[PDB]
Amino acid sequence: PMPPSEFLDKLMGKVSGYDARIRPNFKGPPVNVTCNIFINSFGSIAETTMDYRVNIFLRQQWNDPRLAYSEYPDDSLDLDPSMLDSIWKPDLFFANEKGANFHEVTTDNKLLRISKNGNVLYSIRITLVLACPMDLKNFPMDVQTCIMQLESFGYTMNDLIFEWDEKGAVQVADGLTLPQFILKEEKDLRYCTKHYNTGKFTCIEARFHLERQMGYYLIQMYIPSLLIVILSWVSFWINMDAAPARVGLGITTVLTMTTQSSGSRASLPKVSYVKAIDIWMAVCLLFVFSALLEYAAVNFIARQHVEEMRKLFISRAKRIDTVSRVAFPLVFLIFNIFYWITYKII
Amino acid sequence: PMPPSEFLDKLMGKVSGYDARIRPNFKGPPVNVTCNIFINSFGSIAETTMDYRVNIFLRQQWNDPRLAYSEYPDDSLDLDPSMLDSIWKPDLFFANEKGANFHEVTTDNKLLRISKNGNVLYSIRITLVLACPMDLKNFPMDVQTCIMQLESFGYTMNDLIFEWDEKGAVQVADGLTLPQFILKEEKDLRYCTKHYNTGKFTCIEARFHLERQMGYYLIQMYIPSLLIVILSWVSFWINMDAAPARVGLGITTVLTMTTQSSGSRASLPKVSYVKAIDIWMAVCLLFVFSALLEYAAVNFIARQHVEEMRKLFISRAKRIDTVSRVAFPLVFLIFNIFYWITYKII
Amino acid sequence: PMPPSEFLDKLMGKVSGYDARIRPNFKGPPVNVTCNIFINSFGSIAETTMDYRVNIFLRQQWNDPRLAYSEYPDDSLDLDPSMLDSIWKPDLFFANEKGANFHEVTTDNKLLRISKNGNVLYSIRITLVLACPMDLKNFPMDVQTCIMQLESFGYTMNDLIFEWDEKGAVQVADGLTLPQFILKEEKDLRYCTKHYNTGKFTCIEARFHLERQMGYYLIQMYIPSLLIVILSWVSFWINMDAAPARVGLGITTVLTMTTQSSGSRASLPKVSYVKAIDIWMAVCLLFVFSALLEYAAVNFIARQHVEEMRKLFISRAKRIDTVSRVAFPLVFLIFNIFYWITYKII
Amino acid sequence: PMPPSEFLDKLMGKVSGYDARIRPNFKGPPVNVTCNIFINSFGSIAETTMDYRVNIFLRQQWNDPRLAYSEYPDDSLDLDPSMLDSIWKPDLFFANEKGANFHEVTTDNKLLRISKNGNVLYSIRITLVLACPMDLKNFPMDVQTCIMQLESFGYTMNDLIFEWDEKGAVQVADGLTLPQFILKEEKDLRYCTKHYNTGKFTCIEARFHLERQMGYYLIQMYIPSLLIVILSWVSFWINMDAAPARVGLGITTVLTMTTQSSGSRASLPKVSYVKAIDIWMAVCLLFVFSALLEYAAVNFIARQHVEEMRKLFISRAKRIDTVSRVAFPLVFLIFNIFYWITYKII
Amino acid sequence: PMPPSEFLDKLMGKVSGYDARIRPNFKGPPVNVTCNIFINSFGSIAETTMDYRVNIFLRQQWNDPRLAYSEYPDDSLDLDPSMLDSIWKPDLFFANEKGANFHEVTTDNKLLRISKNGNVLYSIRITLVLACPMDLKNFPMDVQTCIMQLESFGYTMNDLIFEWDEKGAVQVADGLTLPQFILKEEKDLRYCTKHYNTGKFTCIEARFHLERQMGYYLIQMYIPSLLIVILSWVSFWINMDAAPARVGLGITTVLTMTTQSSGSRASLPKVSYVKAIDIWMAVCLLFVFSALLEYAAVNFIARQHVEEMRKLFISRAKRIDTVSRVAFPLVFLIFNIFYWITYKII
Numbered sequence A, B, C, D, E: 001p002m003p004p005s006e007f008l009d010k011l012m013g014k015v016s017g018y019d020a021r022i023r024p025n026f027k028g029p030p031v032n033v034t035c036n037i038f039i040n041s042f043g044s045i046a047e048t049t050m051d052y053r054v055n056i057f058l059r060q061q062w063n064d065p066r067l068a069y070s071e072y073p074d075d076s077l078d079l080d081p082s083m084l085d086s087i088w089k090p091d092l093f094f095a096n097e098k099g100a101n102f103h104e105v106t107t108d109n110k111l112l113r114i115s116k117n118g119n120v121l122y123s124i125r126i127t128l129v130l131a132c133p134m135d136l137k138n139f140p141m142d143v144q145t146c147i148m149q150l151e152s153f154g155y156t157m158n159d160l161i162f163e164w165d166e167k168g169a170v171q172v173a174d175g176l177t178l179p180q181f182i183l184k185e186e187k188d189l190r191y192c193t194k195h196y197n198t199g200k201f202t203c204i205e206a207r208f209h210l211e212r213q214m215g216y217y218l219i220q221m222y223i224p225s226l227l228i229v230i231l232s233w234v235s236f237w238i239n240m241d242a243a244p245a246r247v248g249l250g251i252t253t254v255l256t257m258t259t260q261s262s263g264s265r266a267s268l269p270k271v272s273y274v275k276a277i278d279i280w281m282a283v284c285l286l287f288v289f290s291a292l293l294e295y296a297a298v299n300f301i302a303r304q305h306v307e308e309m310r311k312l313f314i315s316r317a318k319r320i321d322t323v324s325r326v327a328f329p330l331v332f333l334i335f336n337i338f339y340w341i342t343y344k345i346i
């Protein structure tokens, strides 16, 4: 009969004394809050900052006996967020926020329904910029594991406990994809119960596995790394006589790799350890330096020399020919097969 | 007689009991809300982020019987937004906001008029930064289809339904243009009714087709890609004798394309698949590498050699001349005609 | 006697019934609002965004008969903005805001005085970031005309009309200058009365003419464009015999222009049409390519050749000398005189 | 006895009628407000924007007879900013704000004490981003004079007047330094009384003198400008015979200066006039172009030529030797001594 | 019995007269406030700005006799931050904020418990962007000491005093690390009691020592600095006869160092003094300039010359050979051993 908001005026109003400043089950067991998330947006995973932005629908559920309506004939009584500041709400924060905000476009993006037995479904749209430290040992073939963990800031573990629900604690949007990663379907769910000099607080955290789309880096970095090598090999297929041709083909290619390695770590943090993309472009350096270093041997032995003179110099230009025409493709290919098996096993 | 705002004090005030926290037609059919938009601003379509900013006038219309004034002699009773927080308003949010805000310069940019029969026109200026994933298979000749979709966050499909109005659901400003695209006049309008573990919610979405102005990329990228080829052809129109001239004209041009392809994907996301602008600048690579690779053949056969010697070496420098003087323009032009027909058919 | 704020407690308070939610002259003629602006800041005209930031003092004046004090012995009764939310205020917004904000440092930067006959002077400091589409046909010699237009968002043309005042509708700060433009003193003032599917609304807009300081671009772009040409001419003043000197002076200069044109459109939007700065740096390309193309002719005819042989080859190296020693300065200067007259007439 | 805040409940409360909306000395002389500042932070002087950020403690002092407590036995009655919105406060704004904000971390950073005779000390932490137009005639040796000026926005000069106090109107933090400038101890204090079509308003402004640390620019710009010159001089100490060595040493150095001047005005606004750093790097251009221009003379006269032939050509290669071996160090050093005295006198 | 929030309605409410605007121990000794922090986030130490962002849990403790509950049977009475604006709170600000904000995601991240004897534990999550001037004498091997200092803004030293607690005044997160530094465990704690023309205020500050991960700079900067040297040494292992080979290997390497030093101070403020990374890359300059300077000697003495002629020129090419083949590795290695011991002792 009476309008339910008018019903809720006495549901939680000064009549019946719903004090929003006192958790349910006061002085009893803690408040068991089941949580799950829904991921609209995901991406902008900046490694310069080692964070990422997500746009989730945080759903919470707890049981408040003070909210147990009985007269009403249905199961759910939704209510606009205008009085969402009227009921008790758990102080779930994100232990690695690094910035977050509500969405208030045309309305507070909030949801509030209440079952007969006091079950409170509480859902709000959030945009987080979560911090996840990036492990970059094997950079272009890394599997980053960024996390988001939900703690309680004020209430201790003996008054408020979080939990994930079993029926799909983490849903993802239907066509949600990324420009650079693959959000692997397996998603871990484990506790991260904290301790301070103030007490112990509740935590739960879902670990998102991330694997890179190697297609991009395969193009901008590896192929340019690979052309300079083959360009540095036919430089040895140059004319037999040492002329300024090898003078050009040598230093030109080395200068490429010098600039390549510059833009190599362009959008990369200043990590002290050595990653995998650079040792590729390191080995690519010492081969292209082998070219200018090899002609040093040729131009050295050539200026040495004349029967016995030319008979021994060209004998050096020949053994140096039949070796470099296969040695560079020999070690460079054996290096490649070893490099990629090292990273195809992780 | 009485001032209508003073009339509205009893229109929605505590007299007559207009509770703003209870939707119209409560416990009856859902609230049928017709929507349309008006686009002032449009642009800043960043592909680094794959989003875009728009400045719209969202108009809504629903019928609230509680707002049915009868005494008054006219059709419309506008009212400043100061009491726009006084009436019920649907919680239309944008399912792909990624940031949005109201405009509050000198007044809340809001509009509110009410017909005799309870029709509520509600219009507000909004600045959205909407997320649209970019498909970049054929990059400079792509037709991106960015969308904006209007969902309800709290009310389920059985209590609130959105709809587009038939009489021009999407107007565009008179001289609205873009720096890079053409907002095609055809604009699609279809439902995107959602489902969650909470229920099903209303959605409507308008698909904006976008086609690129190819004029820019035709200049900064293609012509510089095209000069290096012709510069790499008259390099073969060099003197007959193999001199360091071809030493210069070869590696110089190849270094251009190396730097060209660097700035090629300058403002482009790190997409794993291969787009169309790069295979252009890829084929431009393997021709300019053909130049330095061709002189490798010339300088190789030249150092081989003398009656029978010169009689067979210059016979190779001639067949290599009459072929390269037409072969590069042969395959390069046939490539061009094939490339552009592949992209003039989409 | 009584304090005038205490006087204004009954001026607009619940006594005498000043309802701030009802415009003056209700049900009568529209409210004639005269406006003018004062420009403190102006600049940051970003062409990457095609907008600009301004810091104005928007003065408004309308007549409200409800504000007609009679007892008081003076003309003006100022009042701090603390009760500036107490009176009626027109909802003037900026039709091309693209971001704007009030200034609230140590006080709301607001002004409010009221004449005896109800005249309301209302002035507030605003920082706008206004959108003006840039026309870049003739880029370094363009005259951009950015605008700012003042519309009413809620009230229709039959209830509220804006106007500029005749006595200097737009003042500019005394020493206000720009880093790149000259704010021409002539400032246009014309209506932009709008129409929608909701009605017709009031508008007024002041067109600011802007002309560029060509001094900067004359230095960073044109001179470097001009040195490469003269460097590409004395390259032909090289030794008579074709040596690797022309091998160097040719490709070196062309590589400059390639990088010049890269940084040419560095801070420029991706406009499809062709502007004027590039056709300059385009013509500068085809002359420097003429150098490497000319030596192609020299090195070609030289390798052709010997009495009749040298007697006809050097006859070609001579006619090619007396022509290129004046032809490049011939066409290049005639091009310059034509280019600058094309742009000195607009 | 009674708690002084409870004392201030009747100090300014509805008892005794302290109306915060009415300035002291109403209808009498204007309110004489003495001001001074204290500078915590200072820096981020961006010339791309021509502004700078400061973090000051604005102290104000005015006398309000309505605040004259008599019963109390002490001189000062501080009070937390919670009731700082309760008293009258002057509307001091900053005429060149360009952005400013309060600091609200753990409390509004505000101070409020009141002497017996009504003296109000009012102090608040502010972070300003003030606009100062930069004069860049002599760029690396410029003395910028940025200002900050304190106006009143609402009250006219006949109702409110600002003043600096004599006892150290501008204090600076003890170890406050800058990365690029030296905040000279002399700080000017003069009025900037304004006039509009609304009246005349109070102003005071303190002029901060700033002088650059020339040490940085002496390293990144001048030394690289200076190495290319000496590298372009020993290029003339090359072998007597004109070989491709001068072919290399000439164009290589000129290309450096071309890229040097690119990054010269890297972080510099697009000012039309010519500054001092560029004419340095301009004169450095025309000397390095003299090198490639000089070898043009050598390679020209060399190809001219043979008894009388070589007897006159080498006579030109000798007079060109004994001159260039001292002429470049002659004019270049005389240029340096003239350049630096032009800028050591300002 | 009664709900404690309802108990706190009379704990601090208008009954019993808890005036939040009056510090504890009024007119007595100052309020002794013990503080400690807990560091979640730490990093983004930008030297371009010379600041850094931290995410701390500021815990405060003071004793307020007015908050002494006696009836209740326990030690602690937590309470949600909804009434955290109800009690007195010290106005601790950060003397070098440069920007800071609260975290309000799903609740104000705040904590409030009260012991029986009035002890108030008050803890709030804060994100600071603190200013620390960077000392960059020895840049890649520097030990920066950034600070954060906690002052009181309003209350003087005779009414409010801060202190650190002895039991671990500064805790750090368990796995908190940085991308570039090592937060040394030793953390200093000393007073910074201030003085102004208003009085003396309380301060405490914790000095965080920071030492760099030299691993990154060891790779991007030093190795490229080191390859050019060895590339500039085997350039002297070139053929005995002076050919254009040394023409290439000389200027090519010098151009590398020119571009190296460009990107050397890429992300570095414009400090006037000379740091350590540049004198490394300065000494690397004058060795690679020694190469092109050395061949100047070779090509000079070579063109001088013929029995006595060649007998004295090659005698110079030999003593120049046996010296440069060890002199560059001689001085360069002795330089290295001296450089690194200068920086391994600090």
Ligand SMILES: *[C@@H]1O[C@H](CO)[C@@H](O[C@@H]2O[C@H](CO)[C@@H](O[C@@H]3O[C@H](CO)[C@@H](O)[C@H](O)[C@@H]3O)[C@H](O)[C@H]2NC(C)=O)[C@H](O)[C@H]1NC(C)=O
Binding pocket: A025, A029, A030, A031, A032
């Ligand atoms: C929130 O969930 C926790 C997790 O179960 C609940 O704690 C558990 O509550 C049950 C119900 O009383 C306890 O069962 C009893 O345990 C005692 C001692 O173990 C046993 O002797 C009894 O026969 C009975 O089985 C259980 O011990 C207790 N466990 C823990 C770890 O707390 C809690 O009650 C829930 N609170 C709410 C408000 O839902």
Ligand SMILES: *[C@@H]1O[C@H](CO)[C@@H](O[C@@H]2O[C@H](CO)[C@@H](O[C@@H]3O[C@H](CO)[C@@H](O)[C@H](O)[C@@H]3O)[C@H](O)[C@H]2NC(C)=O)[C@H](O)[C@H]1NC(C)=O
Binding pocket: B025, B029, B030, B031, B032
């Ligand atoms: C909002 O619009 C929807 C769409 O039409 C309305 O739902 C429709 O309402 C009509 C009016 O009663 C229903 O017509 C009746 O349907 C029954 C069963 O189909 C039929 O036996 C009756 O003879 C009569 O035609 C219609 O069924 C119903 N359809 C749906 C899908 O809901 C709704 O009433 C509107 N609500 C408001 C508040 O305007």
Ligand SMILES: *[C@@H]1O[C@H](CO)[C@@H](O[C@@H]2O[C@H](CO)[C@@H](O[C@@H]3O[C@H](CO)[C@@H](O)[C@H](O)[C@@H]3O)[C@H](O)[C@H]2NC(C)=O)[C@H](O)[C@H]1NC(C)=O
Binding pocket: C025, C029, C030, C031, C032
């Ligand atoms: C705001 O300014 C407009 C512009 O003038 C005012 O509208 C004009 O008001 C005058 C005053 O009554 C009207 O004059 C009368 O016009 C009728 C019909 O044209 C004529 O027969 C009468 O003899 C008399 O001249 C005028 O028509 C009217 N014009 C328009 C276009 O509205 C308006 O009254 C002003 N409102 C306020 C509140 O100041």
Ligand SMILES: *[C@@H]1O[C@H](CO)[C@@H](O[C@@H]2O[C@H](CO)[C@@H](O[C@@H]3O[C@H](CO)[C@@H](O)[C@H](O)[C@@H]3O)[C@H](O)[C@H]2NC(C)=O)[C@H](O)[C@H]1NC(C)=O
Binding pocket: D025, D029, D030, D031, D032
């Ligand atoms: C704020 O400071 C100004 C600056 O002094 C005060 O104005 C001055 O007030 C004195 C005090 O009455 C005036 O002195 C009188 O001047 C008249 C005419 O000059 C003279 O005949 C009298 O013998 C007496 O000396 C002075 O003229 C006046 N000057 C100005 C420029 O206003 C003002 O009173 C101060 N207001 C407050 C609230 O402190």
Ligand SMILES: *[C@@H]1O[C@H](CO)[C@@H](O[C@@H]2O[C@H](CO)[C@@H](O[C@@H]3O[C@H](CO)[C@@H](O)[C@H](O)[C@@H]3O)[C@H](O)[C@H]2NC(C)=O)[C@H](O)[C@H]1NC(C)=O
Binding pocket: E025, E029, E030, E031, E032
């Ligand atoms: C906050 O902590 C300070 C630091 O101790 C307290 O100040 C100290 O308070 C004690 C307690 O009365 C004073 O002791 C007395 O000192 C006098 C003179 O020195 C001596 O003759 C007495 O026999 C007795 O020892 C002590 O002097 C005083 N020192 C200072 C520097 O203030 C303060 O009382 C504490 N306040 C609160 C509210 O906890």
